[PDB]
């Protein structure tokens, strides 16, 4: 019926290797929402009575979410996760505390990087305290990786520390070897007013023209070895104008109006 312990509870079979399918776990969660109704209605208000109910509420939700990453059902995971986040944050000494709690937190963190919202990581990290309620061990990989990307390093970023957990963090790295590439590439657009093609490709870590083309589309850069890094630099220069006064001076209407009232 549930996702609870014992194999008489239908989602539990999907969590274990009794159903080897990665998409029958995620799939089967939709049914499970009906069985969830009774187990999640009570513990959305915290009390020590509601402690038995909490564990089971979380079990159905976590298990389903975890398996989704393996087959890259990832957007569906992020809506499922949200519910888990509130239970992990709070509901102290009623057993949010599990092996599952740890795995789930790290999975979410990895995802914020996959969207490339640096900002989203910092707010989120603090929200859960997802760095001292299960500690930086597995959790360490996204936190350190986000700090390195923010810093501007693309050489101590790590992906090796994300393969220390194999709790389905192992499938996020796949889509975070994209992201490191993306970031180097944007920074290079800002970096050069114009430099040689040769000097810029070894830092991209592209060395085949196909790789150059692929990300160049995203940048707005035209052709493969040839690229126009220059767009971003061009933007700085207009401060030089003075000839059209109305906008350039600015707030000409505003300052006058208030001044007239006062006198």
């Amino acid at each position: 019926l549930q996702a609870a312990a014992g194999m008489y509870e239908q989602l539990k079979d999907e969590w274990n290797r009794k159903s080897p399918n990665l998409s029958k776990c995620g799939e089967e969660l939709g049914r499970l929402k009906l069985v969830l109704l009774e187990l999640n209605f009570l513990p959305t208000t915290g009390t020590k009575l509601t402690k038995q109910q909490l564990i089971l509420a979380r079990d159905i939700l976590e298990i389903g979410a975890q398996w989704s990453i393996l087959c890259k059902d990832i957007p569906s995971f992020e809506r499922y996760m949200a519910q888990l986040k509130c239970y992990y944050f709070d509901y102290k000494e009623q057993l949010p505390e599990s092996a599952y709690m740890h795995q789930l937190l790290g999975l979410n963190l990895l995802f914020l990087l996959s969207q490339n919202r640096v900002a989203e990581f910092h707010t989120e990290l603090e929200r859960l305290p997802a760095k001292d309620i299960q500690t930086n061990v597995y959790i360490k990989h996204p936190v350190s990786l986000e700090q390195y990307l923010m810093e501007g390093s693309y050489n101590k970023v790590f992906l090796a520390k994300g393969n220390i957990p194999a709790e389905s963090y192992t499938f996020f790295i796949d889509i975070l070897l994209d992201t490191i590439r993306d970031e180097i590439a944007g920074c290079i657009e800002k970096a050069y007013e114009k430099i040689l093609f040769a000097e810029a490709t070894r830092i991209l870590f592209f060395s085949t023209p196909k790789k150059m083309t692929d990300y160049a589309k995203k940048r707005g850069w035209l052709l493969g070895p040839n690229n126009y890094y220059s767009f971003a630099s061009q933007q700085q220069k207009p401060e030089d104008s003075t000839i059209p006064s109305t906008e350039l001076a600015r707030q000409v209407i505003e300052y006058a109006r208030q001044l007239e009232m006062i006198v």
Binding site: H122, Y148, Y192, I195
Partner: protein, 238 residues
């Protein structure tokens, strides 16, 4: 909640110091540190000698970390003058670590004082300094000189590689708190500078900003001035 607060201009002194202070904590993690540091410095001054004391402590401790986040290098006078220097001593260590440009000292301090920081609510802000350790050191070197090699930046700061230092500077100029354009031809990092700002609106724009800010004081003052004597008239004054 911060965004919704209009927080009135006619508010008590303790209210003013506390609001700016909260808004600063929120902004600092966000990578809006330029604004956070100004409100937080202001907050300490504005807060009293008596009622404020619990929160007050907390503003001076947090602020030292927050200023570093911008790339400010906080003075020794700041620590000595309220006479709290002892409690401030660990933050002082972070100030040194940020300046030098080497990560090893910054990571070590973060974990060791970790528990103490968490109370004050600093710990979330401490971890953000890792970008800042390097940033503050590249920032002094890029602004001061014109064209300097990534190789100079790396030897002085104790960065891993010139190449490493090259990505780090690229990201910063995108953030725009170091403002430069990099030419990786010969391999130097180049300063922005026009050697005349009269051809540009900037001296005018600077003056104009003050004029808006000034006008706000006049409008605020005319209304505020009559209100207490008016209140007294109806209630009857001896």
């Amino acid at each position: 909640l911060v965004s919704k607060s209009v927080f009135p201009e006619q508010a008590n002194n303790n209210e003013w110091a506390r609001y700016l202070y909260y808004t600063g904590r929120i902004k600092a993690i966000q990578l809006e540190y330029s604004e956070a540091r100004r409100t937080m410095t202001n907050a300490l001054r504005k807060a009293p000698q008596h009622t404020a004391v619990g929160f007050k402590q907390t503003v001076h401790k947090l602020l030292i970390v927050v200023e570093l986040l911008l790339g400010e290098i906080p003075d020794r006078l700041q620590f000595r003058q309220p006479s709290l220097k002892r409690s401030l001593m660990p933050y002082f260590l972070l100030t040194q670590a940020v300046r030098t440009g080497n990560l090893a000292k910054f990571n070590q301090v973060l974990d060791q004082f970790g528990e103490k920081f968490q109370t004050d609510g600093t710990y979330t802000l401490i971890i953000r300094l890792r970008h800042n350790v390097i940033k503050t050191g590249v920032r002094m070197i890029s602004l001061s000189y014109s064209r300097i090699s990534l190789a100079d930046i790396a030897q002085k700061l104790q960065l891993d590689s010139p190449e490493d230092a090259e990505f780090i500077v690229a990201k910063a100029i995108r953030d725009g708190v170091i403002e430069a354009s990099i030419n990786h031809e010969k391999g130097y990092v180049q300063s922005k500078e026009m050697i005349d700002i009269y051809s540009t609106r900037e001296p005018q724009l600077a003056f104009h900003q003050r004029i808006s800010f000034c006008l706000d004081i006049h409008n605020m003052s005319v209304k505020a001035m009559r209100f207490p004597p008016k209140s007294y008239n109806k209630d009857l004054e001896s």
